[PDB]
Ligand binder design. Structure first.
Ligand SMILES: CCCCCCCCCCCCCCCCCC(=O)OC[C@H](CO[C@@H]1O[C@H](CO[C@H]2O[C@H](CO)[C@H](O)[C@H](O)[C@H]2O)[C@H](O)[C@H](O)[C@H]1O)OC(=O)CCCCCCCCCCCCCCCCC
Ligand code: CLA
Ligand code: CLA
Ligand code: CLA
Ligand code: CLA
Ligand SMILES: C=Cc1c(C)c2cc3nc(c4c5[nH]c(cc6nc(cc1[nH]2)C(C)=C6CC)c(C)c5C(=O)[C@@H]4C(=O)OC)[C@@H](CCC(=O)OC/C=C(\C)CCC[C@H](C)CCC[C@H](C)CCCC(C)C)[C@@H]3C
Ligand SMILES: CCCCCCCCCCCCCCCCCC(=O)OC[C@H](CO[C@@H]1O[C@H](CO)[C@H](O)[C@H](O)[C@H]1O)OC(=O)CCCCCCCCCCCCCCCCC
Ligand SMILES: CCCCCCCCCCCCCCCC(=O)OC[C@H](COP(=O)(O)OC[C@@H](O)CO)OC(=O)CCCCCCCCCCCCCCC
Ligand SMILES: CC1=C(/C=C/C(C)=C/C=C/C(C)=C/C=C/C=C(C)/C=C/C=C(C)/C=C/C2=C(C)CCCC2(C)C)C(C)(C)CCC1
Ligand SMILES: CC1=C(/C=C/C(C)=C/C=C/C(C)=C/C=C/C=C(C)/C=C/C=C(C)/C=C/C2=C(C)CCCC2(C)C)C(C)(C)CCC1
Ligand SMILES: CCCCCCCS[C@@H]1O[C@H](CO)[C@@H](O)[C@H](O)[C@H]1O
Ligand SMILES: CCCCCCCS[C@@H]1O[C@H](CO)[C@@H](O)[C@H](O)[C@H]1O
Ligand code: OEX
Ligand SMILES: [Ca+2]
Ligand SMILES: [Cl-]
Ligand SMILES: [Cl-]
Ligand SMILES: [Fe+2]
Ligand SMILES: [Mg+2]
Lengths: 38, 38, 57, 114, 342, 30, 504, 81, 34, 36, 33, 34, 64
């Protein structure tokens, strides 16, 4: 069954994905705007 | 404004004196209130 | 007899010590800060009992 | 071959590139946290351990006159007056165990004054 | 190909005031959280429910006595995730139960990984050999052995070191009383590496500073150096003669000298880490059996080795009830080991 | 035997010092 | 010339002599396993699997033979106590003989591959230079590992064609080798479910077969090939060392905490079973069950198996040893002969008192006796002059139930104090200290030694991964940095992107 | 130099001080009030000086179970009357 | 909880003041990089 | 069949003195524990 | 003293085997040109 | 001629902002009485 | 170099040194599998650790 701690594991997993997701989303956007001149 | 108006030696003196005030307050606290043994 | 209480401590290899436990043992508490050269002892055997070598070293 | 054969005793030219090392170490932290002057870098290497060991020697030398470490035994007290232990009090428990056991036959009176 | 990956690679490796890199994605959040968590906990968080100790500025402790303390022994080796089954997502309970200790220890571990990846990353971009990253393996080995392996060998995180000045002092003293850690030859090698490393640091810096060439006219000799100059700034030949005549031997190879300076402290820290791995299992160098057999049978036999065990026995009996509260040790006065009078 | 072993090892090290000092590789300037 | 720490680099571009060195290493390791088993067999005492099991005797490889189904000697004995068994060829001796013969065969193969190093197979067909296609070698070797993994779980562990593995009850009383069915549900990931071990090898093996076919048929992407230097064999060394210390840490932990693959009848109890009084609780439950069913106190304790009681003794706790206390545990407290029985202490008022047990942390520990509420009622004083809890003052007696002292009661203080000093160690045993000249000082078990060695090695191999990974990624500057390194690339502001000359 | 305005430039400009003569005192005062209102105690679960012990009790409220540790602490907190 | 707005009001009154003095310069910095 | 990968090995005198010193000191350190 | 008797040969081989290794390497370096 | 909001700006303020807040909290603690 | 019967049979298995797939190839598929494997290790670690507790999974010797 879905124990309270299995629920906690899912909440932990989705939290990390969100944190990593927003981090790379911000980084990719910023890198697309402030490009190096070659 | 004009990035260089206030002389740096004044800046350093005022910042220095503020450090002294805040660290003195901490040593005062060692002799009064919590953690004073009294 | 480091602490001056007639309780001698063994420091040397021949008297049961290894490299880790061995020592030259400090001079006796009965001597305090008195100067204890060989010639202030009545014998070498006295000097050794009282930790004379520590001072010399 | 060992890279040590790339230096010859007494050669006039330096054997490494201090601009490269500064360029690396400057980026590891930030540029102004790194030495570019070999003379002041090596002075720092001398001064830090020497000054520190001077203070250690002065510690033993001043505790020789029984000016001891900070004592915070029972410094924290609650509203009623109960002792609230800190890590300093745990250190004190260990010190007591050393105190009462050391030179177990040498003291006749309750205080170890030297 | 100039896809999003290469564009991002460009931005991460810009030459800015603080270099970032790919390694910075791991390094900066984990280093920042580890530090912030230590500052947060030493300022605001108690150790009452895990240790019976006050441990924060808010409670009246000072810089020497604040700590972030280990969790209670009943937590075992629990990761103590905030959303885990112990705290159940409650931030306040999580603090009271010791959650900040795993938080700091784990983010710290990954921060150190991030720092070493940064040394590799910057070295590859600048074009230097990665010996600085290799030397940093020793602090990582110490952190990992002392803060992770050691408690994992023991009953719980409780017995890991707590993150505080006086808390660490208690750890040193615990290791003398229970492990006889001064007797351990792996610690002895670590001491030699640390003290010999300090020795090398002082003596190399003093030698360079006192064999300088006069490359300028000022009494302050620092000004007479240019980073791009080709010549050595001090005389290896004179340095070599002085030390040969003072001490018998001297360095003659400057590359060997500086490798040796890498080698000595690094190797010593690695040796001490191996000893602590042993102590994780109570695999101590506690006794010399031959000394004990003689001393048991001969009450006149006494060495500094037997003297120190009496000290360890005092430490154990006098600190254990307070230091291990979950054990509920009640030692009546009459059982406490004590010498005469004291 | 332990005592003999300890003193033997110590004596070798002292002999090592002698050779390391007086029969070292001579440093040569080039 | 080559410095001494580099002599083995002559094999980097010589695949035939690399195989010879690998063959010779494999012969040495196989030889060690054969000679270790022979030495163990010449010293092992099979006569008492109850109080003198293999883990009391310093046996290291014997448990690993027993774990996978080798339990008997050609001489007719078995580790579970049976006599008159015929183990077939695959006795402990037959296993050791096969490793010795394998070692000699591999030695001869090594000589052949050393001499005939210049085989056309090791040359690139286009360029004629020595060359190994490591991407495809991985797939081949991964495919073989998959097959072996799968066949081990599917046939050997299941008993479909093979012996199975060592399984036991939760208290390590009735261990034996048994066929094990795989567990396919979530409990298969329980480290204490042996069916999980069977399912892992069936399912990881199949994945390895699939993955192996993939790395055989699909070339590496250019971007990974460049990034990882897949033309450089030292990149395989670096990643292989990384996998190897990962695995060493895992086997060290599962040996310390216990699992289905580290049974206590082969390696001894864990430290945590003493921390939590795991065995003492089962002992007391069985004694309570007996008393509940009308048995007397002497019948309740006489029914406890000696083997169960022996686990409830700190001398079998692996956390009680010392780094330089060498040899079998029998060299310390002696060879266990009999359970003396359960000591029960009482005071002059007839209250039962309980000795406080020694925690594993403590080399020595005071003798303290409490009532059932934890109130101190007697002890052995240090300072006598203000003692109030002395055995003499409190009238402490000891009575034994079960074991060789069953039914006896002692009342003289010095004998009662002697038994109470033993009681801090848990259940009390009679030991033969003479046969081995035991010194009375505790030693750790094979569980301790295994854990120590593999944790230390795992940590050292971490340094190996760092070193060889550094050498792989920085090969171009191994002998120094470029003499013509311009200041512009290392000073700030010249290039927009660090290291990139196209951003000036 | 890597493009950013020099620090000596910034901290000697009137505008820097116009902004930071507000923002620095304001953060300081926010930290003060976090303690002075008692909020810091309740965020972090730190005892006040009158909350380490019940009036007569001398035992530590030590957590002794792993999965009921949260209830143990809440129970210990009720027992303060 | 009144204490949360008493502790955050000095923080948010500081972040508001630094915007009135930096907005004519920040608009100029973001438009320049676009 | 002359294998072309062979290289001479060296150990200079200074390295001999350093190696002997390490070995002898390590033995002086560990011998007490070997005897126990 | 009741020391472990294996300590003697353990210490002796600990010194001798690695010292011999270095002596072999050094002497064949000298004998080279 | 110079940008205001950079990575160095962010790094400086993630450390400096909480440091001033914590200093105010610790200053307040010096007047707490048991 | 020396040909042998067994060498001739194994020749095709050591003939593609240096052969690569253009660009990124299957790297994204590899990333997905690595991410799955991380979640897998995380699960078995947390089960062993008693941070993840499942019905009918009793991490104890009492599971025989
Ligand atoms: C190189 C440097 C790289 C840089 C560092 C990288 C940072 C990565 C961070 C990873 C953190 C790992 C967390 C491991 C926590 C743990 O272990 O937690 C421990 C748990 C086991 O739980 C413990 O188990 C013990 C024994 O219990 C067992 O026995 C009991 C008593 O009989 C009961 O029967 C009980 O039911 C039964 O479970 C006790 O219960 C303890 O309280 C409990 O904490 O193991 C587990 O989760 C997993 C155990 C198997 C995997 C072990 C591999 C990893 C650890 C290797 C270290 C080994 C060192 C050993 C000493 C040397
Ligand atoms: C950026 C680097 C970084 C890293 C490496 C870590 C690492 C860690 N954090 Mg930290 N943390 C970070 C940044 C980071 N943190 C930041 C920016 C914050 C502020 C928000 C925090 C705030 C924080 C808190 C409050 C806590 C941690 C904790 C932890 C530890 C456990 C985390 C965990 O289990 O996640 C597991 C999650 C993942 C591994 C995500 C991986 C995603 C996979 C690869 C893809 C699949 C996801 C999929 C798309 C979603 C499916 C959902 C579905 C199943 C329902 C671990 C050491 C915990 C701790 O320290 O306990 C003591 C803890 O309580 N962190
Ligand atoms: C489908 C059914 C199935 C079942 C029932 C199992 C069952 C099992 N698997 Mg298997 N597995 C399967 C399929 C299956 N597997 C498949 C298809 C694959 C892909 C090939 C795997 C790949 C795999 C791996 C890689 C591992 C397992 C393991 C296991 C065992 C886990 C219990 C345990 O003891 O963990 C104990 C191990 C862990 C909980 C993992 C810990 C990892 C550590 C924490 C990472 C940290 C490393 C770091 C460097 C350490 C230093 C830190 C320290 C210094 C502080 C269990 C027998 C584990 C095992 O064999 O354990 C003995 C294991 O490591 N499986
Ligand atoms: C995985 C490795 C391993 C493990 C865990 C064991 C475990 C065991 N062995 Mg076995 N053994 C092994 C490999 C191993 N062995 C090998 C490779 C051999 C062939 C030599 C043997 C031959 C052997 C014999 C002949 C015997 C054993 C016995 C035993 C048992 C007692 C162990 C003991 O007292 O050690 C004591 C451990 C130490 C004293 C630790 C040594 C620490 C070293 C010296 C540190 C060196 C540090 C180094 C100098 C640092 C350099 C620093 C520099 C780089 C700066 C124990 C079950 C005994 C037994 O009871 O059999 C029934 C027994 O008689 N073993
Ligand atoms: C799979 C394991 C493995 C393999 C195949 C290699 C292979 C290599 N190593 Mg690497 N290395 C490893 C693991 C490995 N290493 C580990 C775990 C570490 C950390 C300890 C290192 C740290 C390391 C360094 C610092 C260096 C190498 C170097 C080398 C190269 C030259 C080696 C040599 O000539 O030594 C010659 C060695 C001797 C002549 C005597 C060594 C005696 C040892 C120290 C004690 C004896 C131990 C005993 C005999 C065996 C115990 C087995 C053990 C696993 C239980 C060679 C490619 C060198 C290199 O890169 O050259 C360019 C180099 O400088 N390695
Ligand atoms: C206690 C002694 C000690 C400290 C405090 C220390 C500190 C440091 N060492 C560094 C470097 C090094 N140390 C090295 C060799 C050594 N370092 C040694 C011992 C120390 N080294 C020794 C003995 C050696 C000889 C082998 C080398 C070769 C380097 C470097 O190259 C590197 C450097 O740059 O030097 C200038 C820096 C790494 C910065 C970093 O990781 O940021 C990131 C921050 C992170 C990842 C946070 C980690 C969090 C930590 C691990 C846990 C939390 C700690 C709390 C916040 C504070 C607790 C404090 C209480 C205990 C009182 C840092 C200044
Ligand atoms: C080829 C060269 C061979 C010689 C090389 C140099 C040898 C030096 C000695 C090294 C070991 C010394 C052992 C102590 C002396 C002794 O008496 O042992 C003696 C013990 C044997 O123990 C004996 O056993 C007897 C019954 O069989 C009796 O009980 C004896 O009383 C008992 O002493 O030797 C061993 O069993 C040790 C075997 C190895 C076990 C290794 C476990 C740990 C491995 C990991 C180490 C990691 C360290 C990495 C650091 C980096
Ligand atoms: C001025 C007070 C100095 C007190 C401490 C002494 C510092 C220097 C001694 C180190 C000797 C190491 C071996 C010699 C190494 C050696 O040869 O040094 C040489 C080095 C350079 O020599 P120069 O000839 O160029 O200059 C020295 C004189 O000739 C003056 O020109 O000397 C200095 O730089 C002296 C600096 C004095 C100014 C120091 C100011 C004090 C700062 C203290 C801050 C920390 C306080 C304690 C906090 C915990
Ligand atoms: C934990 C946690 C977290 C985090 C947090 C953070 C990140 C924080 C930070 C914080 C901080 C960041 C803080 C800081 C502080 C600081 C301070 C408090 C300082 C002080 C200082 C001083 C006091 C000084 C002194 C001195 C010195 C040192 C030397 C010189 C002289 C003088 C005296 C000046 C989160 C939320 C994520 C989640 C939950 C948990
Ligand atoms: C030829 C031939 C043969 C024979 C063979 C043989 C007879 C073999 C043997 C083999 C062997 C018999 C081997 C052995 C080996 C061993 C080894 C290889 C060992 C090693 C060791 C080690 C490595 C150790 C180390 C250590 C020490 C010493 C101390 C402590 C620490 C350690 C652990 C590290 C036959 C008829 C079959 C057939 C074919 C032909
Ligand atoms: C993690 C690394 C995964 C690379 S993924 C890779 O990224 C490129 C962008 O540079 C795309 O053009 C390409 O189609 C995509 O497969
Ligand atoms: C000898 C005093 C009379 C009381 C019995 C003492 C506790 S029991 C005694 O203890 C010895 C040490 O473990 C063992 O060697 C021996 O087998 C055992 O009989
Ligand atoms: O002599 Mn050596 O130790 Ca200086 O305290 Mn008093 O005295 Mn004795 O007691 Mn503690
Ligand atoms: Ca009051
Ligand atoms: Cl003393
Ligand atoms: Cl006195
Ligand atoms: Fe230098
Ligand atoms: Mg105060």
């Amino acid at each position: 069954t879905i124990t309270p701690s299995l629920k906690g594991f899912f909440i932990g997993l989705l939290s990390g994905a969100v944190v990593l997701g927003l981090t790379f989303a911000v980084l990719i956007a910023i890198s697309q705007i402030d490009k190096v001149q070659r | 404004s004009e990035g260089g108006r206030i002389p740096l030696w004044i800046v350093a003196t005022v910042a220095g004196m503020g450090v002294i005030v805040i660290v003195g307050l901490f040593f005062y606290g060692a002799y009064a209130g919590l953690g004073s043994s009294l | 007899d480091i602490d001056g209480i007639r309780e001698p401590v063994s420091g040397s290899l021949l008297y049961g010590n290894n490299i880790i436990t061995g020592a030259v043992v400090p001079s006796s508490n009965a001597i305090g800060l008195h100067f204890y050269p060989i010639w202030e002892a009545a014998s070498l055997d006295e000097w050794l009992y009282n930790g004379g070598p520590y001072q010399l070293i | 071959e060992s890279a040590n054969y790339g230096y010859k005793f007494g050669q006039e030219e330096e054997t490494y590139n201090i601009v490269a090392a500064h360029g690396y170490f400057g980026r590891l932290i930030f540029q102004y946290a790194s030495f570019n002057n070999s003379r002041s870098l090596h002075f720092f290497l001398a001064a830090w351990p020497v000054v520190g060991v001077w203070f250690a020697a002065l510690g033993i030398s001043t505790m020789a006159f029984n000016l001891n470490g900070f004592n915070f035994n029972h410094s924290v007290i609650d509203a009623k007056g109960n002792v609230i232990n800190t890590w300093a009090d745990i250190i004190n428990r260990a010190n007591l165990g050393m105190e009462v056991m050391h030179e177990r036959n040498a003291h006749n009176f309750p205080l170890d004054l030297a | 190909e100039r896809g999003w990956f290469d564009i991002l690679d460009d931005w991460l490796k810009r030459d800015r005031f603080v270099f970032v890199g790919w390694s910075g994605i791991l390094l900066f959040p984990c280093a920042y959280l580890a530090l912030g968590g230590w500052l947060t906990g030493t300022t605001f968080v108690t150790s009452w429910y895990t240790h019976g100790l006050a441990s924060s500025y808010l409670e009246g402790c000072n810089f020497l006595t604040v700590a972030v303390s280990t969790p209670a022994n009943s937590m075992g080796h629990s990761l103590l995730l905030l959303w885990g089954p112990e705290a159940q997502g409650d931030f306040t309970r999580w603090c009271q139960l010791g959650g900040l200790w795993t938080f700091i220890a784990l983010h710290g571990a990954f921060g150190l990984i991030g720092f070493m990846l940064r040394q590799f990353e910057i070295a590859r971009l600048v074009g230097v050999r990665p010996y600085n990253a290799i030397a940093f393996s020793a602090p990582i080995a110490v952190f990992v052995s002392v803060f992770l392996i050691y408690p994992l060998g023991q009953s719980s995180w409780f017995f890991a070191p707590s993150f505080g000045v006086a808390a660490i002092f208690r750890f040193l003293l615990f290791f003398q009383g229970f492990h006889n850690w001064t007797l351990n030859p792996f610690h002895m090698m670590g001491v030699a590496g640390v003290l010999g490393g300090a020795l090398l640091c002082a003596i190399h810096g003093a030698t360079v500073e006192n064999t300088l060439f006069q490359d300028g006219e000022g009494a302050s000799t620092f000004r007479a150096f240019n980073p791009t100059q080709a010549e050595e700034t001090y005389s290896m030949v004179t340095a070599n003669r002085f030390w040969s005549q003072i001490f018998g031997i001297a360095f003659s190879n400057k590359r060997w000298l500086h490798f040796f300076m890498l080698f000595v402290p690094v190797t010593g820290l690695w040796m001490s880490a191996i000893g602590v791995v042993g102590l994780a299992l109570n695999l101590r160098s506690y006794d010399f059996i031959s000394q004990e057999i003689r001393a048991a049978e001969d009450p006149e036999f006494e060495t500094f080795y037997t003297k120190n065990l009496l000290l360890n026995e005092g430490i154990r009996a006098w600190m254990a009830p307070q230091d291990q509260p979950h054990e509920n040790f009640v030692f009546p006065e009459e059982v406490l080991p004590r010498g005469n009078a004291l | 035997m332990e005592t003999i072993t300890y003193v033997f090892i110590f004596a070798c090290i002292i002999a090592l010092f002698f050779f390391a000092i007086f029969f070292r590789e001579p440093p040569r300037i080039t | 010339g080559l410095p001494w720490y580099r002599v083995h680099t002559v094999l980097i571009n010589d695949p035939g002599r690399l195989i010879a060195a690998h063959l010779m290493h494999t012969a040495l390791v196989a030889g060690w396993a054969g000679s270790m088993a022979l030495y163990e067999l010449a010293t092992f005492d099979p006569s008492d699997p109850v109080l003198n099991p293999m883990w009391r005797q310093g046996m290291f490889v014997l448990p690993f033979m027993a774990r996978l189904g080798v339990t008997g000697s050609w001489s007719g004995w078995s580790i579970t106590g049976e006599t008159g068994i015929d183990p077939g060829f695959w006795s402990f001796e037959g296993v050791a003989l096969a490793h010795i013969v394998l070692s000699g065969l591999l030695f001869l193969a090594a000589c052949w591959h050393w001499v005939y190093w210049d085989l056309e197979l090791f040359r690139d067909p286009r360029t004629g230079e020595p060359a190994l296609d490591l991407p495809k070698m991985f797939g081949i070797h991964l495919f073989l590992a998959g097959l072996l993994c799968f066949g081990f779980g599917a046939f050997h562990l299941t008993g479909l064609f093979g012996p199975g593995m060592w399984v036991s009850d939760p208290y390590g009383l009735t261990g034996s080798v048994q066929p094990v069915a795989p567990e396919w549900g979530p409990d298969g990931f329980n480290p204490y479910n042996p069916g999980g071990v069977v399912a892992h090898h069936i399912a990881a093996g199949i994945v390895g077969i699939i993955a192996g076919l993939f790395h055989i048929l699909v070339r590496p992407p250019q971007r990974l090939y460049k990034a990882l230097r897949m033309g450089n064999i030292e990149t395989v060394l670096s990643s292989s060392i990384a996998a190897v210390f990962f695995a060493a840490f895992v086997v060290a932990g599962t040996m310390w905490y216990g699992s289905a693959t580290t049974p206590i009848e082969l390696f001894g109890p864990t430290r945590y079973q003493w921390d939590s009084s795991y065995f003492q609780q089962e002992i007391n439950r069985r004694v309570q069950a007996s008393l509940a069913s009308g048995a007397t106190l002497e019948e309740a304790w006489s029914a406890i198996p000696e083997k169960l009681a022996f686990y409830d003794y700190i001398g079998n706790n692996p956390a009680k040893g010392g780094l330089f206390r060498t040899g079998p545990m029998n060299k310390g407290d002696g060879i266990a002969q009999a359970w003396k029985g359960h000591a029960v202490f009482r005071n002059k008022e007839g209250e039962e008192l309980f000795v406080r047990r020694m925690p594993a942390f403590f080399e020595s520990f005071p003798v303290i006796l409490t009532d059932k509420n934890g109130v101190v009622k007697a002890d052995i004083p240090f300072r006598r002059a203000e003692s109030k809890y002395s055995f003499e003052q409190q009238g402490v007696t000891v009575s034994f139930y079960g074991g060789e002292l069953n039914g006896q009661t002692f009342t003289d203080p010095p004998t009662v104090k002697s038994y109470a000093r033993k009681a801090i160690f848990g259940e009390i045993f009679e030991f033969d200290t003479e046969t081995l000249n035991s010194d009375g000082i505790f030693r750790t078990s094979p569980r301790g030694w295994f854990t120590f060695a593999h944790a230390v090695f795992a940590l050292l191999f971490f340094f190996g991964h760092i070193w060889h990974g550094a050498r792989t990624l920085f090969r171009d500057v191994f002998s120094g940095i470029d003499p013509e390194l311009s200041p512009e690339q290392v000073e700030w502001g010249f290039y927009q992107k660090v290291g990139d000359v196209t951003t000036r | 130099t890597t493009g950013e305005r020099p620090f000596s430039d910034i901290i000697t400009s009137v505008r820097y001080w116009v902004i930071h003569s507000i923002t620095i005192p304001a953060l300081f005062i926010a930290g003060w009030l976090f303690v002075s209102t008692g909020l810091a105690y309740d965020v972090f679960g730190t005892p006040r000086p009158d909350s380490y012990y019940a009036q007569e009790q001398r035992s530590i409220p030590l957590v002794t179970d792993r999965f009921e540790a949260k209830q143990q602490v809440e129970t210990f907190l009720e027992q303060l009357k | 909880d009144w204490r949360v707005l008493v502790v955050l009001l000095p923080v948010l009154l500081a972040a508001g003041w630094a915007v009135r003095n930096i907005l004519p310069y920040a608009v100029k910095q973001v438009q320049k990089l676009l | 069949e002359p294998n072309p990968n062979r290289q001479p090995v060296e150990l200079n005198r200074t390295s001999l003195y350093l190696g002997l010193l390490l070995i002898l000191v390590l033995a002086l350190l560990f011998s007490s524990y070997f005897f126990n | 003293m009741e020391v472990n008797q294996l300590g003697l040969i353990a210490t002796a081989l600990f010194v001798l085997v690695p010292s011999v290794f270095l002596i072999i390497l050094y002497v064949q370096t000298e004998s080279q040109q | 001629s110079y940008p205001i909001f950079t990575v160095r700006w962010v790094a400086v303020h993630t450390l400096a902002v909480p440091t001033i807040f914590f200093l105010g909290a610790i200053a307040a603690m010096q007047f707490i009485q048991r | 170099a020396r040909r042998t019967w067994l060498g001739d049979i194994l020749r095709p298995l050591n003939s593609e040194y240096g052969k690569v797939a253009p660009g990124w190839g299957t790297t994204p598929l590899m990333a997905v599998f690595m991410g799955l494997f991380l979640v897998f290790l995380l699960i078995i670690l947390e089960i062993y650790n008693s941070t993840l507790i499942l019905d009918g999974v009793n991490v104890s010797w009492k599971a025989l």
